[PDB]
Amino acid sequence: GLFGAIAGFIENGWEGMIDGWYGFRHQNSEGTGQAADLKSTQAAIDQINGKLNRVIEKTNEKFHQIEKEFSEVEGRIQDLEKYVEDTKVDLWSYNAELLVALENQHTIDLTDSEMNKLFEKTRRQLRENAEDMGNGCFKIYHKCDNACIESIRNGTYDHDIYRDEALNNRFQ
Amino acid sequence: LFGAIAGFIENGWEGMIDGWYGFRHQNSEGTGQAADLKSTQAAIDQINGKLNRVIEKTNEKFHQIEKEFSEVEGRIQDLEKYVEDTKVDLWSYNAELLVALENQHTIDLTDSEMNKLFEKTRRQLRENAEDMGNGCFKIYHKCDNACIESIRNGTYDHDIYRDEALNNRF
Amino acid sequence: LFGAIAGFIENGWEGMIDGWYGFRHQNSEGTGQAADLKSTQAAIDQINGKLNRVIEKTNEKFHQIEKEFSEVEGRIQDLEKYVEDTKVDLWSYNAELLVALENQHTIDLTDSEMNKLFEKTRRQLRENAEDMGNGCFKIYHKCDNACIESIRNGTYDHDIYRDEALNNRFQ
Amino acid sequence: SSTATLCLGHHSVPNGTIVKTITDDQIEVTNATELVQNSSTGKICNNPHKVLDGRDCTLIDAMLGDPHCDVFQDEKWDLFVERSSAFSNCYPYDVPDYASLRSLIASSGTLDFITESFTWAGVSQNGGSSACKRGPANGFFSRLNWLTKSGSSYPLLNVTMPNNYNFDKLYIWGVHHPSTNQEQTNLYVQASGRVTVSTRRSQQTIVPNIGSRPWVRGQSSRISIYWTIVKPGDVLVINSNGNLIAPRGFFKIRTGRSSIMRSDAPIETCISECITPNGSIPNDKPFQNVNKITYGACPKYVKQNTLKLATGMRNVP
Amino acid sequence: SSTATLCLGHHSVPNGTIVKTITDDQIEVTNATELVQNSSTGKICNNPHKVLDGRDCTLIDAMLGDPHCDVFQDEKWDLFVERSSAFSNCYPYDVPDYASLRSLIASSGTLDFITESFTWAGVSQNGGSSACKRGPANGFFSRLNWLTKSGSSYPLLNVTMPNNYNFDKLYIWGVHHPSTNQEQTNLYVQASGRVTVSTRRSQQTIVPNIGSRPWVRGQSSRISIYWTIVKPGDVLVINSNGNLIAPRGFFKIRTGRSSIMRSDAPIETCISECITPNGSIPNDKPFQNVNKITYGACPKYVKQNTLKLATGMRNVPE
Amino acid sequence: SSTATLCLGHHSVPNGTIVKTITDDQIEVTNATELVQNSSTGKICNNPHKVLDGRDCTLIDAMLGDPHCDVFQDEKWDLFVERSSAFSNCYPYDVPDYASLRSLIASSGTLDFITESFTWAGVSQNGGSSACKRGPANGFFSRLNWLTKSGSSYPLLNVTMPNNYNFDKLYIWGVHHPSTNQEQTNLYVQASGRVTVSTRRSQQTIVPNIGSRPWVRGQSSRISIYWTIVKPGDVLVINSNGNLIAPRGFFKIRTGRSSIMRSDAPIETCISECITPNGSIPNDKPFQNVNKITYGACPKYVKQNTLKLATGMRNVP
Ligand SMILES: *[C@@H]1O[C@H](CO)[C@@H](O[C@@H]2O[C@H](CO)[C@@H](O[C@@H]3O[C@H](CO[C@H]4O[C@H](CO)[C@@H](O)[C@H](O)[C@@H]4O)[C@@H](O)[C@H](O[C@H]4O[C@H](CO)[C@@H](O)[C@H](O)[C@@H]4O)[C@@H]3O)[C@H](O)[C@H]2NC(C)=O)[C@H](O)[C@H]1NC(C)=O
Ligand SMILES: *[C@@H]1O[C@H](CO)[C@@H](O[C@@H]2O[C@H](CO)[C@@H](O[C@@H]3O[C@H](CO)[C@@H](O)[C@H](O)[C@@H]3O)[C@H](O)[C@H]2NC(C)=O)[C@H](O)[C@H]1NC(C)=O
Ligand SMILES: *[C@@H]1O[C@H](CO)[C@@H](O[C@@H]2O[C@H](CO)[C@@H](O[C@@H]3O[C@H](CO)[C@@H](O)[C@H](O)[C@@H]3O)[C@H](O)[C@H]2NC(C)=O)[C@H](O)[C@H]1NC(C)=O
Ligand SMILES: *[C@@H]1O[C@H](CO)[C@@H](O[C@@H]2O[C@H](CO)[C@@H](O)[C@H](O)[C@H]2NC(C)=O)[C@H](O)[C@H]1NC(C)=O
Ligand SMILES: *[C@@H]1O[C@H](CO)[C@@H](O[C@@H]2O[C@H](CO)[C@@H](O)[C@H](O)[C@H]2NC(C)=O)[C@H](O)[C@H]1NC(C)=O
Ligand SMILES: *[C@@H]1O[C@H](CO)[C@@H](O[C@@H]2O[C@H](CO)[C@@H](O)[C@H](O)[C@H]2NC(C)=O)[C@H](O)[C@H]1NC(C)=O
Ligand SMILES: *[C@@H]1O[C@H](CO)[C@@H](O)[C@H](O)[C@H]1NC(C)=O
Ligand SMILES: *[C@@H]1O[C@H](CO)[C@@H](O)[C@H](O)[C@H]1NC(C)=O
Ligand SMILES: *[C@@H]1O[C@H](CO)[C@@H](O)[C@H](O)[C@H]1NC(C)=O
Ligand SMILES: *[C@@H]1O[C@H](CO)[C@@H](O)[C@H](O)[C@H]1NC(C)=O
């Protein structure tokens, strides 16, 4: 939510992209199509992982400890033992709460970052051959067939081939 | 972390008593100032909830150990003091780290909502205006009060003034 | 998190010994390199302070419980060992989480200062230049050494080259 | 004038507040709030908890039955407040492991006492001392029975009391330590006393010690206080050759959220869920700097006296 | 149509999960994983730890030598399980500082006992009681020698036993508390007993207590249990005027990662590192809400029952 | 021509550090610093803390008055150092609740002793033994008086000493355990001794116990060490039938930041605010991995041996 892409200028998520986490959708003369971007998906997954492993990694072996349940009242020592256990449990409960909240907030922010980074990169690729609507979609101003879209998705798009075509169609 | 406040905006308007973020325009009819309720409420809803998850009541304790002593005893008293001292230090660090972490995130998000409003206005005025390096927009067509209000509402149409603005631009 | 370093900048200039960030220009007179003090000092002022808030002295303890024992005793020794073990494990978690959180923010803030310099330059050269996708700018007019220094200073005027650059960009 | 200017900005305030971030130590924000409570009203609110004020009495003295602590019989409390002006005005005594007895009585939260019909054959009962006055003449601790010789013989005592209830019983008994060998024989005939109190799972035996001690309220002797707990279905047996301070019954011991606190703050009519020795404090804030000793729903104690949490953007005036 | 359209977006899911962030409390994400383990199988796995089930016996009774606990002699364990149904069936006794003795025995992880040749001159040994039956005949705690008068005299006992080994010796002894003076004189000629167990660096002396006590298995008398540890190169001296419950040897005491746990769960054939009184639990998660008493490689105990951790973007379906 | 190119970038270094972040575990940055101190200088610095080295003496033995510990009379310290080679060379003894007495002496920070004029009528004083030699003659613990019979009688002792000062007093006394009945009657006429030391709010009575104990410097007997504390305005009473190891005075007990530490590291002339048994460690870092026993302004103990904190951007080649 901190970069304004998901729940932002994208509006909605595509329920139906079973191939990846981020992808492209195009409307063309030949017909509409859909693809998935592995780089942004694998970058986000590799960040969600590692994050998981740092939390999950086992860090606790304890064998002999203090008694934590009692059947007879005794006084000072029992008061001390219970107070120690209560303090330990409360401190670890706070640590778990703060960890989960902090990790979840960063998880949302990095998914916006990857989406906004993909959008910005495509803007640089489509230098002056397209302009941006406020819906997360681009309007290409030249005849862009299926091989043309595949080149944009790959990153091998050449703007000089279609520059004068778009500039004429953009400005009178 | 986003520029904006203490950044490409330079200064903060002391006098916007209507909201947290807003617009100011210089027009052929005159100058004006308004406030944006979407971004202001979005921020307030984020500072809130942050406040509630911190303020929420916990720590109901009834019987505990003794923490003040009149007679020197030795092993047990030293143990009871060390337990209490360790607890107090760990919570003090928890309080300091929490405040510092939340305060940084509060600054970062307030930058985000201003940057988000700035880019929303930029995408509305597609080619009818261009970015002056101060957080202000120079609109290249005649834009009356109804025109400015349409921009603030989000119902601005660039196709109406596209060819007029393009002529004055280039 | 902002895409500048390990992103649309590709590489790092191993050889900038003057500052953390800077400009490299290719010109008719020749190539050159400079450094930006504002962003470098802003980042340095942020890594510092973070360092000082972590490095400040905090605890001064004199008399405590025993932590090593020569004879097995039972209940009291078990409590004393458990208390010390609980304390050490909690602080070790605090040290680990603190380092992970600060390092993540240090990486992020260095992207921000770089992305903020790039966005400031793009807003400064409004229509006289346009992006290239590698952290560089294609300036569409003649820009000598004094011209470049005016961009780095922030005293660049875009109207002096507006018509020349617009014609070179469009029809 | 075929153009227009549109600017975006944020509010500023004439007076900001300084907070602490991670990258900076002194940064100004428009609004901020305080997370640490560093003040107390000084008035201990009497609601919602049941606060019992022991004016001149400690908990043990009230439990024992000091004549000037008699107004506390069969009392109950959520929090017992022990004043620093408290004193003892009965027979000099000491309690081995005094803190543990005080703690478990405080956690029980009640002084409900049930008198049981003990039978002490061959000995005289209801002893009194000039050190423990009940009005104009000698008296003793209530809830306790001083036994001495009847005539010229002190017989061996063997009494029993089963626990036919479904709750635990707490018994308070004592042993008398004379100051001279003559005082031992004058009250108990036998030259060496002995007290044994035991159940099916525990035992206690104390041998009295004869010797001079500091003179407190006219007495060179002392009394040691002991306690025993009898589970349901268990039985209590007391065997004594002499020097026995017999119990008069048992204390009903409960499990609850009661405790004891030392304070000198006055008690007023108000509502507060958190109690400290300095008084009552509100608990709207997560942390507090007043005292590390608290009772109730209280903010956690921290060393810092101030912690500001930002509730607005940075103030750029 | 001279123009095309290219749209960038992110996936949604028909069903999301609710997590908790810093700014919001209820926010939906595409995927999430649970971090708290809140269920127990109920079956205590017998691997990889060596779990010893003491059915009707406590650890102290097994150490002392209760006849119905004789199957536990010279045992060893990693976790000793004490069932709620255990009972004592020997001479009634109490252990001053019972918890410390139980804790150090449990941490030792062994009941290996070595018999030593003590010489008690002038007294009769191997006494027993009807309260502690070994089959049809009267018996006593094993590893424990009840000494009474021989004939009409009870001589002074002054015995020594050095530690010529390279490991600590754990000794267990006791003092017998008669109920009447006529019984104290009958068992031991001296009217007031005394037991002194000492080393070069520590001493313990007990005076027996006389008094009537509630009948436990027909006995009004009691026995108190004490322990002494002899370092290598040290020496043990026992001096007594009577009322001595002599030891029969020393327990080997080791340093290890053993412990004791009170539970009623059954033990099954399975594999699990973490043992709780509620049973064994897996350790693939960093936190657990089952029990605060644990043994082995366990998740840390927390108060919360659930903690969802986000593993995807926010879910925004319309 | 007719154009130009302007590029924006960041520095790189030919060599980075591997640090750890939230998302990754191995990421390279230009600059980083260590936060965990994992080394000690091996030399305990004598500044600014006042370090006292008890070469062959433990704190209790120095307090008691062992003849080879006589050089430690009226000493003061901030940190007492106990060496592993310390031994005892006087009458064999044991201290019930040894650790607590060691704790309160160490925290008191001083061994300031004041001799008081006790009157022991009818008994001979200044006992000694071959086990505790002071030169060529038999001696005993200083600050301790061994009282035995005078002629053929051992009277009852009843002596008092009030606390007319405004600071607490610490009294160290003892009880003698003979090895045989014949030795008990030989030193004290009575066949069974008794020591009672009490104040207006406390009492302690010990009945000695006869029996052989291991040979320690020619002695099969033992001495048990106890302590009592008298508040200002309170009084001390000692009543003994025999076997009493009387005190010669009181220790002045203070409140401060003194402690004790067990180490075998040497002491040098240097300045260090933090002391560990391994030696003195610098405190320029927030965490340390040398030892969990510390004294002074010290980094917190952690299990990790290294924790790198990034101080530069990511290193990209
Ligand atoms: C109750 O039982 C205990 C033991 O069972 C008896 O205590 C023993 O008492 C004897 C003395 O009567 C002790 O023996 C003495 O040992 C000294 C050396 O001790 C050891 O340590 C050194 C190293 O420090 C070794 O070198 C040495 O070999 C020993 O192993 C000797 O120095 C003593 O001197 C004897 O010999 C010389 C002649 O050379 C004579 O002049 C002396 O008078 C003396 O006879 C002596 O050998 C023995 O150590 C004690 N044992 C314990 C365990 O304490 C009690 O006496 C007994 N009580 C009763 C009432 O019977
Ligand atoms: C053993 O010694 C103690 C003191 O060393 C003796 O106790 C003392 O006894 C006298 C009375 O005999 C007490 O005096 C009293 O003082 C009050 C005023 O405080 C006065 O009003 C009384 O009339 C009486 O005179 C004295 O306080 C007391 N001292 C202490 C410390 O207890 C004790 O009598 C001696 N025992 C034997 C058997 O000699
Ligand atoms: C002191 O009091 C205790 C308890 O008040 C007495 O203990 C009791 O002793 C009697 C034996 O006289 C026990 O009764 C026995 O019961 C069986 C039947 O189960 C019967 O066959 C025997 O002949 C005998 O009567 C009784 O259980 C026991 N109770 C307890 C609680 O210990 C003790 O005898 C008294 N001693 C003196 C000297 O008065
Ligand atoms: C609350 O009361 C406590 C008393 O227990 C105060 O703490 C003491 O304050 C005095 C005066 O500064 C110091 O000399 C003592 O050393 C303090 N004692 C302890 C144990 O800290 C405390 O200052 C009071 N707080 C408020 C807000 O009234
Ligand atoms: C990377 O190597 C550089 C050297 O190229 C290190 O920096 C300096 O190294 C010289 C020796 O070549 C020393 O004299 C300086 O004191 C060093 N300065 C600093 C600030 O370190 C640098 O430390 C190395 N960094 C890493 C991460 O290995
Ligand atoms: C690497 O970082 C350290 C800081 O962690 C730099 O050294 C610091 O320099 C400042 C003065 O500017 C001092 O106040 C600090 O005490 C120094 N700290 C340390 C650890 O040396 C160091 O110059 C940096 N080096 C490079 C090559 O970036
Ligand atoms: C600051 O915020 C609090 C709520 O967190 C509010 O009650 C208060 O009125 C605000 N003050 C100002 C000056 O905005
Ligand atoms: C979501 O997480 C679950 C584990 O809880 C896993 O089985 C599933 O494959 C994950 N799906 C995606 C799309 O990550
Ligand atoms: C585990 O057992 C304890 C009893 O000691 C009980 O309080 C708790 O609710 C149980 N938890 C589970 C998950 O079975
Ligand atoms: C410090 O000394 C302890 C012994 O008490 C030893 O275990 C540890 O390894 C030592 N550490 C260092 C850094 O010397």
Numbering used by the authors:
A (entry chain T): 332 to 503
B (entry chain S): 333 to 502
C (entry chain R): 333 to 503
D (entry chain B), F (entry chain A): 10 to 326
E (entry chain C): 10 to 327
Sentences copied from the publication:
One of the key factors for host jump is the switch in sialic acid receptor-binding specificity of the virus, mostly determined by amino acid residue substitutions that occurred in the receptor-binding site (RBS) of glycoprotein HA. The discovery of a degenerative codon at position 228 in the human H3N8 A/Henan/4-10/2022 HA protein sequence, which may encode an amino acid residue G or S, suggests dynamic viral adaptation for human infection. We find that the human-infecting H3N8 HA has a dual receptor-binding property with a preference for binding to avian receptor, and the G228S substitution slightly increased binding to human receptor. We then solve the structures of the H3N8 HA protein in complex with the human receptor or the avian receptor, and identified the structural basis of H3N8 infection in humans.
Next, we solved the apo structure of the HN/4-10 H3N8 HA by X-ray, and the complex structures with avian or human receptor analogs [LS-tetrasaccharide a (LSTa) and LS-tetrasaccharide c (LSTc)] by cryo-electron microscopy (cryo-EM). Furthermore, the RBS in the apo state and in complex with receptor analogs displayed minimal structural alteration. Comparative analysis of the overall structures between the G228 and S228 variants of HN/4-10 H3N8 HA revealed a remarkable similarity. Temperature-dependent circular dichroism (CD) identification showed that the midpoint transition temperatures (Tm) of S228 and G228 were not significantly different (45.4°C and 45.2°C), indicating that the HA stability was not affected by this substitution. We compared the HA surface AS of H3N8 S228 HA with those of Seal H3N8, 2004 H3N2, 2011 H3N2, 2022 H3N2. Although the AS distributions are generally similar, the AS are not conserved, and the main differences are at the AS-A and AS-B sites. The amino acid of the AS of HN/4-10 H3N8 HA were significantly different from those of H3N2, suggesting that seasonal influenza vaccination may not effectively protect against H3N8 infection. Only six glycosylation sites were found in HN/4-10 H3N8 HA, located at positions 22, 38, 45, 165, 285, and 483. The HA of the S228 H3N8 variant shows a stronger adaptation for binding to human receptors compared to the G228 variant.
